[PDB]
From a paper:
To investigate the oxygen binding site of PnFPOX, we attempted to soak NaCl into the crystals of wild-type and N56A PnFPOX, since the bound chloride side is considered an oxygen binding site in MSOX. Although bound chloride ions were found in the structure of PnFPOX N56A with NaCl, no chloride was bound at the W2 position. Therefore, we concluded that W2 could not be a putative oxygen binding site, but that the W2 position is in the plausible main oxygen accessible channel. N56A showed decreased oxidase activity compared to the wild -type, while its dye-mediated dehydrogenase activity was higher than that of wild type. Interestingly, in PnFPOX N56A, Lys274 cannot form a hydrogen bond with Ala56 but instead moves toward Asp54, forming salt bridges 2.92–3.35 Å in length. This movement results in the elimination of the water molecule from position W2, although Lys274 can interact with N5 of the isoalloxazine ring via a water molecule (W1, 2.81 Å from Lys274 and 3.11 Å from N5 of the isoalloxazine ring). The analysis of the protein channels of the structures showed that the W1, W2, and W4 positions in wild-type PnFPOX (W1′ and W4′ in PnFPOX N56A) are in the main oxygen-accessible channel. In PnFPOX N56A, the movement of Asp54 and Lys274 blocks a short and plausible main channel observed in wild-type PnFPOX (blue dotted path with arrow in Supplementary Figure S6). Although the oxygen could be accessible through another alternative long path instead of the closed path in PnFPOX N56A, the elimination of the accessibility toward the short pathway might result the drastic decrease in oxidase activity compared with dye-mediated dehydrogenase activity.
N-valyl-histidine derived from proteolytic digestion of the N-terminus of the HbA1c β-chain. Fructosyl amine oxidases (FAOXs) are FAD-containing enzymes that catalyze the oxidative deglycosylation of fructosyl amino acids such as fructosyl valine and/or ε-fructosyl lysine, which are the degradation products of HbA1c and GA, respectively. As members of the FAOX family, fructosyl peptide oxidases (FPOXs) are also known as candidates for diagnostic enzymes. A covalent bond is formed between FAD and Cys343 of PnFPOX as observed in amadoriase I (Cys342), amadoriase II (Cys335), and EtFPOX (Cys347).
Residue numbers in the entry: 1 to 431
The structure:
């Protein structure tokens, strides 16, 4: 007879990443026996190639629809109040800025949506250079001519690697089982007459459990057949070094974001500032056969920086990140950029998550579709994956997250354009 919580075993594939580690965290917190939880990943938690594993990330701009609202609020509560996560959230505030008549109009209606969702207390509209420089004087009046902004008091950045590592340490201490590398890289579900009973990894190690969760990020559509519900894309970052004097000047600075430029935020403990641009992402299409598809298909397969650490970023991304520096930090415009790299995410057509049982395999549950904006949900997203496993997922979440092949083009998703492909963007490959 099929089990209580204490007797239920769960494998989390990709449990070294954002959604996976959250899932393992909430299994244990909700009272699964730790030894009954297995975390499998290609790399040790925090996984080298996890989009959530770098020294610092920003919370980022919320999406403006009610499910994302509720998730981001859940997350915010936990980043403020959860003893595990609190210490890694740096509540510097955020400026979401815009320039151009269309962009500013969209920013303003976005602002109104926030007011109308009841976030008026923590968001203010800034309608001049002066009001923006008040919130961050270190911005350049020349550069932000005619900018307007939303300032969010609740915004900030996240010691992301440190957070996932704290989760990993907690899982470890509690007695979660780990397999990494050959013993952690998913190859295929184990199936008994149409029902999933485990997974086999690349090196042929077999694991058995009552539930399997595929939280494999950008790799999810490469591992099992998803009929293009998820299309995986790379974004880019670089770093600049500030002197101790400069770093101290920039300390406690808000996150600054502009959708036409990119973002940056305060330097870390080592006086390093991370800079990103904003763009529709890059695919890397090639032939690959997920499991559960008759035949190899052209799909976007991440080019992993962990597998290929000599990779950088396309020349065009160097140019766009440079432009961001020159706009945000004109006085640093000559600083050398280092540790430029790509991180991989996976887009759904509607940019909502894909968290559902796989129609073909009972007890095989997808938890992916992160759509380039889910790191903020590290604290909370696992709770809802567990809910799904337990049949208790709220209706609206289950709906937003449901299986939905053929329901839109994820290559474009909600971005401004279909992603370009790395094959056509020179300068990242240094083999
Ligand atoms: C530059 C950049 C800026 C971003 N900005 C923001 C932001 O401001 N705010 C925000 O909320 N989000 C942001 N995102 C997105 C955020 O990083 C992701 O949405 C989130 O981290 C993805 O979570 P995930 O668990 O789906 O994937 P990941 O964290 O990448 O985890 C997937 C895991 O699966 C593992 N895996 C892969 N293949 C296998 C296999 N065969 N077997 C076992 N395991 C496997 C991987 O090793 C990895 O650990 C940003 C991302 C990038 C790259
Ligand atoms: Cl932010
Ligand atoms: Cl300076
Ligand atoms: Cl490759
Ligand atoms: Na990293
Ligand atoms: Na200034």
């Amino acid at each position: 007879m099929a089990p209580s919580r204490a007797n239920t075993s769960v494998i989390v594939v990709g449990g070294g990443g954002t959604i996976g580690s959250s899932t393992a965290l909430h299994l244990v917190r909700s009272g699964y026996t730790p030894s009954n939880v297995t975390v499998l990943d290609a790399y040790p938690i925090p996984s080298s190639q996890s989009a959530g594993n770098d020294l610092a990330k920003i919370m980022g701009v919320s999406l403006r629809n009610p499910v994302d609202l509720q998730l981001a609020l859940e997350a915010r509560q936990m980043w403020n109040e959860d003893e595990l996560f609190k210490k890694f959230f740096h509540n510097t505030g955020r400026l979401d800025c815009a320039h151009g008549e269309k962009d500013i109009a969209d920013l303003k209606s976005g602002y109104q949506a926030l007011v109308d969702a009841g976030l008026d207390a923590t968001n203010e509209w800034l309608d001049s250079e002066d009001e923006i420089l008040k919130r961050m004087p270190l911005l350049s009046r020349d550069q932000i001519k005619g900018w307007k902004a939303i300032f969010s008091k609740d915004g900030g950045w996240l010691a992301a690697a440190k957070a996932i590592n704290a989760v990993g340490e907690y899982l470890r201490d509690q007695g979660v089982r780990f397999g990494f590398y050959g013993a952690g890289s998913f190859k295929a579900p184990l199936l008994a007459e149409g029902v999933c009973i485990g997974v086999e990894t690349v090196d042929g190690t077999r694991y058995y459990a009552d539930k399997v969760v595929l939280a494999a990020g950008a790799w999810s559509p490469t591992l099992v057949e998803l009929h293009e519900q998820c299309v995986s894309k790379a974004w880019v970052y670089g770093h600049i070094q500030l002197t101790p004097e400069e770093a101290a000047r920039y300390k406690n600075s808000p996150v600054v974001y502009n959708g036409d430029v990119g973002f940056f935020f305060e330097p870390n403990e080592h006086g390093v500032i991370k800079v990103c641009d904003e763009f529709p992402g890059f695919t890397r299409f090639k032939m690959h056969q997920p499991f559960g598809a008759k035949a190899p298909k052209r799909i976007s397969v991440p080019r992993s920086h962990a597998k290929h650490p000599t990779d950088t970023i396309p020349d065009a991304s160097d140019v766009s990140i440079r432009r961001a520096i020159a706009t945000f930090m004109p006085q640093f415009k000559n600083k050398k950029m280092f540790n430029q790299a790509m991180c991989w995410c996976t887009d759904t057509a509607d940019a909502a998550l894909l968290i559902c049982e796989h129609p073909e395999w009972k007890n095989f549950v997808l938890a992916t579709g992160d759509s380039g904006h889910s790191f903020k949900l590290l604290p909370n997203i696992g709770k809802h994956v567990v809910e799904l496993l337990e049949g208790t997922l709220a209706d609206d979440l289950a709906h937003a997250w449901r299986w939905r092949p053929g329901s839109g083009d994820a290559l474009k998703s909600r971005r401004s354009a279909p992603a370009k492909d790395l094959a056509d963007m020179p300068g990242w490959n240094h083999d």
